[PDB]
């Protein structure tokens, strides 16, 4: 030991840091045995060990030398013809859909014969050879047709002859096999929509498509399942008198305003199903709705597919004057989300004419921001088929590197209504979308045109006003879900969709990931976060109850959590009751509303409420709880499909003044939607119980919100927590997940408005499933 100088010390320690860094880099270099492990985890291919084409071209030479260093069947007389029948059917189908003509209906149904299909495809070519008339002759080479049903619902689409019996029960997306090779999809409704990508993308979609600023990417959702109807007034060519009335009948007086007529922005809100038979009106909560208008009179309405079938049935009930237009297989939108979604979307499309909408959209696409733009951004134009490009390219002008809000003020005043609404009129009418397919080419044809440009003359295919298929293209902003949706015809979506993620900062979304995005932005979701409506309650309660009951009864005894014997749940444990509030599984709102009406009956019976000891005399809690258990035991035998139990209050508090016989449950209970964030340690889960703070120990929770600590310097929560009673429940959390954008836990809850006006403070305690701890937090109102 001997003292040294300062400079020698810092030089020796810096040399030691450099030596450790060099040794770590040398160990990392010697640890790798191939360049196949040099790829990122997203781009790793299992096939790349066999063939060279998966590896990038820079790395393939080292891959080739390391691979070199490391190193028509028997068919009977019947099954051969059975295999040649399919090959002849595919060849005749290719020639028939390629040469001139459309699809026969007998080949579409595919329920009679295949020999009749062969005879029909033989007959159509001969009839085209012998005569020009009597031919349903198409407008293009690729087999695209017009699946538009005027005044009726759209039937099962024709598709392709090979994959026809695979479309017998459920229909497909236009990107069905594309999504099938890259994502897990689910068959729930009549389509097959995506559920989640194959690679894990929870935190990835959370950071790139989320509300976070570091969102250097783009996320695309195939939202072709969202069904739209187009309504137009046939009665009068003048101003629309019945349109405002039918909007005020379908929705409330919340989505039928003069501002939405003038500024023509799409609005997403809550639709409720009306029913008027004779002098009586019954209103039930139906679900979400998207309403959009074209300057006065024509309207597109798009929403959930079962809700789409119900709204189409109600609209076909009263179809006296106006003409309806069902669009299930002729128009669909896809949803882009992120910061560079606008840049990739402007990269995917090019211009065919110098117009104002191109300038506005290219000025929007450079700011890399969403919420600084105003509420209305609905752009529309005519563009080229994106198969002309087939390469990741972005187009950006000089623009002198300046972005200000003064250009954003030009977006609110100078809006090209005429051309955008003309593109709207092109997409609504079936004739213009049929005329759009007048010059659709095959991939061989566009490859031949690219070869002609490579021979004559750059990586492009030029535009010709005579023989190029100019499409209508519409890109609009959706407000509350914070995402840009772009709508297009059915067979046009795939040339747009294929060029999207070939931009190397664009990924695809599953509906689980879409639920994560709706959970992140404090928004709501219809199959899960909508329990008040009829279909949401039925679907969520029945399916999650049966699933969780099968999962619980499937596990052996002594490995799962036992819901029957849990001690110390509430203070003063009530007799004949040793379990948890309501059903242990998916949120039984029946228990909550019967308990709320029981406490209301106790408050109407006396100024205070007693604790404990054909309908027996209700004087305390357990007489209500035994009625709850008896009604549950009765409804386990026969399912309930009569009425709902919990509506919303946010439409009732403003106007109806939330006003509420031997009755226990006839008049339902209304709720407001809240989002509560955890201030104490812990995270929420699904089906969580929301309690209220009692009249006692409020100052204890205020001190815990200010500060409570052990003398070590950190937070302390190993204390005797005061237990409230059973009837202090005020809500349910359906979706409980640790919210990564807040650093705490978020629970989407639904609390009573009377209980909201009881406490003067917004402090709410949460309890999980099978866990006996109580965690405090604060809520904010969800105005959705």
């Amino acid at each position: 030991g001997s003292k040294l100088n300062v400079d020698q010390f810092i030089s020796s320690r810096q040399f030691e840091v450099k030596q450790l860094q060099l040794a770590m880099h040398n160990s990392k270099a010697a640890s790798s045995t191939r360049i196949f492990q040099a790829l990122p985890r997203k781009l790793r291919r299992r096939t790349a060990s066999h063939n060279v084409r998966r590896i990038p071209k820079r790395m393939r030479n080292r891959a080739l030398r390391e691979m070199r260093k490391s190193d028509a069947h028997g068919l009977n007389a019947k099954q051969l013809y059975k295999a040649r029948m399919s090959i002849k059917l595919l060849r005749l189908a290719s020639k028939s859909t390629s040469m001139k003509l459309s699809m026969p209906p007998e080949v579409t149904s595919s329920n009679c014969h295949v020999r009749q299909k062969i005879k029909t495809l033989k007959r159509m070519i001969k009839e085209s050879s012998t005569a020009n008339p009597n031919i349903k002759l198409l407008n293009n080479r690729m087999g695209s047709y017009d699946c538009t049903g005027v005044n009726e619902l759209a039937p099962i689409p024709k598709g392709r002859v090979k994959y026809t019996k695979r479309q017998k029960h459920f229909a497909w997306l236009p990107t069905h096999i594309w999504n099938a090779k890259r994502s897990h999809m689910m068959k729930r409704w009549g389509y097959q929509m995506v559920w989640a990508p194959t690679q894990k993308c929870f935190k990835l979609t959370h950071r790139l498509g989320g509300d976070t600023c570091s969102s250097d990417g783009a996320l695309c959702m195939d939202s072709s399942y969202i069904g739209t109807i187009i309504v137009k007034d046939k009665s009068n060519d003048s101003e629309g008198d019945f349109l405002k009335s039918i909007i005020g009948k379908l929705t409330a007086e919340r989505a039928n305003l003069r501002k939405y007529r003038e500024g023509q922005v799409l609005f997403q809100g809550l639709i409720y199903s009306f029913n008027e038979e004779n002098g009586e009106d019954s209103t039930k909560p139906l679900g979400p709705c998207d309403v959009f208008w074209v300057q006065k009179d024509t309207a597109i309405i798009r929403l959930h597919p079962s809700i789409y079938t119900q709204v189409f049935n109600i609209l076909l009930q009263h179809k006296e004057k106006l003409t309806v237009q069902d669009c299930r297989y002729s128009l669909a939108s896809v949803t882009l989300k992120g910061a560079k979604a606008l840049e990739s979307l402007a990269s995917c499309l090019r211009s065919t004419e110098y117009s104002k909408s191109f300038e506005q959209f290219k000025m929007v696409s450079m700011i890399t921001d969403h919420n600084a733009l105003p509420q209305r951004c609905t752009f529309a134009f005519e563009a080229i088929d994106p198969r002309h490009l087939a390469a990741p390219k972005k187009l950006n002008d000089s623009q002198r590197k300046t972005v200000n809000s003064d250009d954003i003020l030009s977006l609110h005043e100078n809006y090209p209504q005429d051309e955008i609404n003309a593109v709207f009129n092109e997409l609504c009418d079936p004739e213009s979308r049929t005329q759009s397919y007048n010059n659709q080419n095959t991939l061989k044809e566009i490859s031949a045109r690219r070869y002609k440009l490579l021979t004559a003359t750059k990586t492009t295919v030029p535009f010709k006003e005579s023989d190029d298929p100019s499409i209508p293209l519409v890109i609009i902003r959706r407000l509350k879900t914070r995402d840009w949706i772009v709508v297009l015809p059915w067979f046009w979506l795939l040339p747009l969709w294929h060029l999207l993620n070939r931009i190397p900062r664009m990924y695809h979304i599953g509906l689980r990931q879409f639920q994560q995005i709706q959970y992140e932005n404090k928004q709501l979701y219809f199959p899960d976060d909508y329990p008040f409506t009829q279909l949401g309650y039925i679907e969520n309660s029945f399916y999650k109850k049966e699933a969780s009951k099968t999962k619980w009864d499937r596990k052996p005894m002594g490995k799962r959590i036992n819901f029957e014997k849990i001690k110390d749940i509430h203070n003063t444990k009530l007799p004949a009751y040793s379990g948890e509030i309501g059903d242990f599984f998916s949120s039984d709102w029946r228990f909550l509303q019967i308990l709320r009406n029981g406490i209301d009956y106790l408050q109407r019976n006396d100024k205070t409420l007693e604790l404990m000891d054909g309908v027996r005399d209700i004087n305390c809690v357990n007489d209500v709880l035994e009625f709850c258990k008896d009604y549950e035991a009765k409804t386990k035998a026969m399912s309930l499909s009569i009425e709902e139990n919990i509506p919303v209050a946010l439409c009732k508090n403003r106007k109806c003044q939330f006003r509420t016989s031997f009755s226990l449950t006839f008049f339902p209970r209304c709720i407001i939607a809240v989002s509560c964030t955890l201030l104490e340690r812990g995270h929420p889960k699904d089906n969580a119980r929301i309690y209220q703070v009692p009249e006692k120990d409020l100052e204890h929770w205020l001190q815990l919100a200010k500060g409570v600590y052990r003398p070590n310097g950190r937070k302390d929560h190993d204390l005797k927590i005061p237990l409230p009673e059973v009837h202090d429940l005020i809500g349910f959390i359906t979706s409980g997940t640790y919210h990564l954008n807040c650093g705490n836990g978020m629970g989407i809850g639904f609390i009573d408005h009377h209980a909201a006006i009881r406490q003067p403070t917004r402090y709410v305690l949460i309890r999980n499933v099978g866990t006996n701890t109580y965690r405090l937090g604060e809520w904010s109102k969800i105005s959705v």
Binding site: M186, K187, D528, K544, E546, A547
Partner: peptide, 24 residues
């Protein structure tokens, strides 16, 4: 909103639809 989806991963997909359903 939990990762353990009982109804979604088995009963509602197209790969495990041939398997006996979770309501059954």
């Amino acid at each position: 909103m939990d990762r353990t989806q009982t109804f979604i991963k088995d009963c509602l997909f197209t790969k495990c639809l041939e398997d006996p359903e979770k309501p059954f």
